[PDB]
Write a protein that binds this ligand. Structure first.
Ligand SMILES: [K+]
Length: 191
RNA sequence: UUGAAAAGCCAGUGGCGCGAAGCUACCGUGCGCUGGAUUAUGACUGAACGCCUCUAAGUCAGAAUCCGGGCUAGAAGCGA
């Protein structure tokens, strides 16, 4: 019914520098740089500075927006929160090999930017997956048959994990019985 | 049949054997192709709805599919 004003605000930690211009949000922190283009959202992004204290706040509001339009405010706020978390602490995804008979052989290429799977269900085909920008994959030593994906962008790390998972789908078999694959087992922060 | 021999001719291709050349047969030989976008589907982040959610905004993989490329033609189209 076109609510007059829907508004939400988030606090910005002092250790992160943020810039907003034409719905283009730049996020800066010790771990690096992250960028996002929110031009597709018909919202008003404002950065509020408290002169006495100096803490930052990001306010996103929609004027005369419907429920569908208003649903994007929290989405944008969560995206900005994810950017802050990635630039301060980083993101760490953990994947585990599951197999019944044929152990899965993983070969990390140079730079920890690609992986090779060779013995999935005793298959002679070699599966190739390339890590996305800013995401590295390493073989865990303390945990048996575990892959660790680290990066600054949550979306890129999660998409790399999804690519690894989907590259090892079982076919022409009852997947309930044939449970072999590589699956995400834990989502966390590097720091 | 030309007197004979030799050498030809006539029987609309006299008939038979072999027959080069050209034509020609899966009856012979050679060749027949790869970038993008996506369907179904499976997913990422993510609200609505403090949780959840492939979906609402945004995003990914994806086919004997579509488009392009390649191949054939080349317009009251055109260049040097
Ligand atoms: K989800």
């Amino acid at each position: 019914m076109k609510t007059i004003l829907s508004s939400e605000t988030m606090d910005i930690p002092d250790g992160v520098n943020i810039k907003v211009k034409a719905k283009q949000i730049e996020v800066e922190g010790p771990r690096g740089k992250l960028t996002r283009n929110f031009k597709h959202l018909n919202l008003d992004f404002q950065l509020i500075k408290d002169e006495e204290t100096g803490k930052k706040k990001l306010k996103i509001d929609a004027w005369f927006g419907s429920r569908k339009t208003t649903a994007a405010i929290r989405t944008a706020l969560s995206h900005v929160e994810n950017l802050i978390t990635g630039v301060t602490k980083g993101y760490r995804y953990k994947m585990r090999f599951v197999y019944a008979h044929f152990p899965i052989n993983a070969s990390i290429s140079g730079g920890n930017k690609a992986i090779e799977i060779r013995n999935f269900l005793g298959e002679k085909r070699v599966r190739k997956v390339d890590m996305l920008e800013g995401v590295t994959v390493v073989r865990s030593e303390k945990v048996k048959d575990e892959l660790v994906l680290d990066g600054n962008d949550i979306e890129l790390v999660s998409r790399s994990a999804a690519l690894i998972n989907q590259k090892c789908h079982v076919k022409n078999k009852d997947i309930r019985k044939f449970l072999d694959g590589i699956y995400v087992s834990e989502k966390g922060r590097i720091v």
